[PDB]
């Protein structure tokens, strides 16, 4: 390594550590939207700077993900896993499962930066976040990062996210949230809607 390469690598590792800390802070606050955004910023920076999880892990030795943080990560994992599968239907099984799975993989990356292979999370088993809240967080993030020209079946992706967010919020408003009513939203491609959704 030339001196410039060493200095550059160290600077980049230090900045990547700061971005990891920001994501961990959002997680600690229970800020689902903020965490997903910060996890994406971490991933983008590491890709840009040619840094891998193994490079950053030693820099995170004095950092910890809390039991609360792990419970939130587990809730996001379970919800994204369930949603990616629910969104794979005979109508379409590529775009919506792909977007949801990418979100899950992005969160997994945040953990891989801190944890060695097969090291277990230590979630607080008593810390619950509502699945409906987690799902809306995922959908809001997908809305933000989906291409404006992206479509799920015949509907604009961003617009279908807004539609599903509203559907989940209507379930919450009527005290009608359960795995079945949530699944109906997750698996829907809006095939019964009177108009094809557009964003703008």
């Amino acid at each position: 390594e030339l001196g410039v390469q060493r200095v550059t690598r160290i600077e980049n590792l230090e900045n990547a550590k700061k971005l990891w800390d920001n994501a961990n802070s959002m997680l600690e606050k229970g800020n689902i939207s903020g965490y997903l955004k910060a996890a994406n910023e971490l991933h983008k920076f590491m890709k840009e700077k040619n840094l891998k999880e193994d490079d950053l892990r030693p820099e995170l030795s004095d950092k910890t993900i809390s039991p609360k943080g792990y419970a939130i990560l587990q809730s996001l994992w379970g919800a994204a896993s369930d949603y990616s599968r629910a969104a794979a239907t005979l109508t379409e099984s590529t775009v919506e499962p792909g977007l949801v799975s990418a979100v899950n993989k992005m969160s997994a990356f945040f953990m891989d930066c801190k944890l060695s292979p097969n090291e277990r999370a230590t979630p607080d088993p008593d810390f619950k976040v509502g699945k409906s809240k987690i799902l809306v967080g995922i959908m809001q993030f997908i809305k933000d990062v989906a291409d404006p020209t992206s479509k799920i079946w015949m509907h604009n992706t961003k617009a279908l996210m807004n539609h599903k967010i509203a559907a989940i919020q209507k379930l919450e408003r009527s005290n009608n949230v359960n795995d079945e009513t949530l699944e109906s939203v997750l698996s829907s491609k809006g095939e019964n809607l009177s108009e094809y959704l557009s964003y703008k």
Binding site: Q74, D82, A88
Partner: protein, 169 residues
């Protein structure tokens, strides 16, 4: 398709899931965000008895972190494939615990398969066939022991599972 069958691939990092995933294709759909991160599933289409079947298999990202066996492990899949590394005793011990629980909590009609694999040919075997077979038999679950040297039986197991799932619906 006439059918879409959802398969869950359960296993730790470095046990040989990558070998089993060689029987599937990458989905060709991408858009900017997916291109940056990638996905955790693969796909394969087969024609069986005049019908087109899409198999979609999830090697769920982050699963190794969360080995409390919650509903994500035992709901929303037609088939569940649990894999250990024949060269790693702890990998087998872990899988015994997970599979016991998955079998307990999953609907009886969900197709299950235990796979012991040697995915790295430079490695040394540890877990006896008989030991793993005895465990699978104790749960009434099919068992496949396989080596990366020959994936014929892996391919066979997936084709059998597809036909079994099709029949049950």
């Amino acid at each position: 398709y006439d059918y879409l069958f959802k398969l869950l691939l359960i296993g730790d990092s470095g046990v040989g899931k990558s070998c089993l995933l060689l029987r599937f294709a990458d989905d060709t759909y991408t858009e900017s965000y997916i291109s940056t991160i990638g996905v955790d599933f693969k796909i394969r289409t087969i024609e069986l008895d005049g019908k087109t079947i899409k198999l979609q298999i999830w090697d769920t990202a982050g699963q190794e972190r969360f080995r409390t066996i919650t509903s994500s492990y035992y709901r929303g899949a037609h088939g569940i494939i649990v894999v250990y590394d024949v060269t790693d005793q702890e990998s087998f011990n872990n899988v015994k615990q997970w599979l016991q629980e998955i079998d307990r909590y999953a609907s009886e009609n969900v197709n299950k398969l235990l796979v012991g694999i040697k995915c790295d040919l430079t490695t040394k075997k540890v877990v006896d066939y008989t030991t793993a077979k005895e465990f699978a038999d104790s749960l009434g679950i099919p068992f496949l022991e396989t080596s990366a040297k020959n994936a014929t039986n892996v391919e066979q197991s997936f084709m059998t599972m597809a036909a079994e799932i099709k029949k049950r619906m």
